């Protein structure tokens, strides 16, 4: 009895464009290869898959990006076993 979730998951909150009058953001999401404060989580992922993609290994058929070399092939073997193109 008392099976309950604490689901306060509300990730986002940020719409706008322009300059900045103050540093803003915080150490919430960091691109693991360069210490740089991202508020948005997609901002962390994009700084990897574009620039800092040497350290991270993306299983090419899906956007599931690994942070290790064995994990790369382990998707294609286990969780993506139709994809040998
Ligand atoms: Zn980076
Ligand atoms: Zn995959």
Quote the CA–CA distance of 64 and 76 in Å, as a whole number.
11
Any idea what the CATH number is for the domain that residue 40 is in?
3.30.160.60
Task: Give the CA distances from residue 78 to residues 6, 56, 59, in Å, rounded to whole numbers and listed in that order.
Answer: 32, 19, 12
**Structural domain that includes position 34:** 1-85
Q: Which ligand is closest to the CA of 34, given by its number?
A: 1
For 25, counting Cβ atoms within 10 Å of its Cβ (0-12 exposed, 13-18 middle, 19+ buried), the class is middle
Among 61, 62, 65, which residue's Cα sits nearest to residue 52?
Answer: 65
DSSP, collapsed to helix, strand or coil, labels residue 66 as strand
Q: Which ligand is closest to the CA of 77, given by its number?
A: 2
Tell me the DSSP string of 13-61.
-----S--SS----TTEE-TTS--EESSHHHHHHHHHTTS-SSSEE-TT
Distance 37 CA to ligand 1 centre (A): 10
Residues with Cβ within 5 Å of ion ligand 1? 31, 34, 47, 52
Q: What are phi and psi of 74, to 5 degrees?
A: -65, -25
Q: Which ligand is closest to the CA of 36, given by its number?
A: 1
Task: Give the CA distances from residue 20 to residues 11, 23, 24, 25, 31, in Å, rounded to whole numbers and listed in that order.
Answer: 22, 7, 8, 11, 21
Q: Domains in the chain: how many in total?
A: 1
């Amino acid at each position: 009895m008392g099976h309950h979730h604490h689901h306060h998951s509300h990730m986002g909150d940020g719409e706008g464009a322009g300059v900045l009058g103050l540093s803003a953001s915080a150490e919430c999401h960091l691109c693991p290869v360069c210490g740089e404060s991202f508020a948005s989580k997609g901002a962390q992922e994009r700084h990897l898959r574009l620039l800092h993609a040497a350290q991270v290994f993306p299983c090419k058929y899906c956007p599931a990006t690994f942070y290790s070399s064995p994990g790369l092939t382990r998707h294609i073997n286990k969780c993506h076993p139709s994809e040998n193109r």
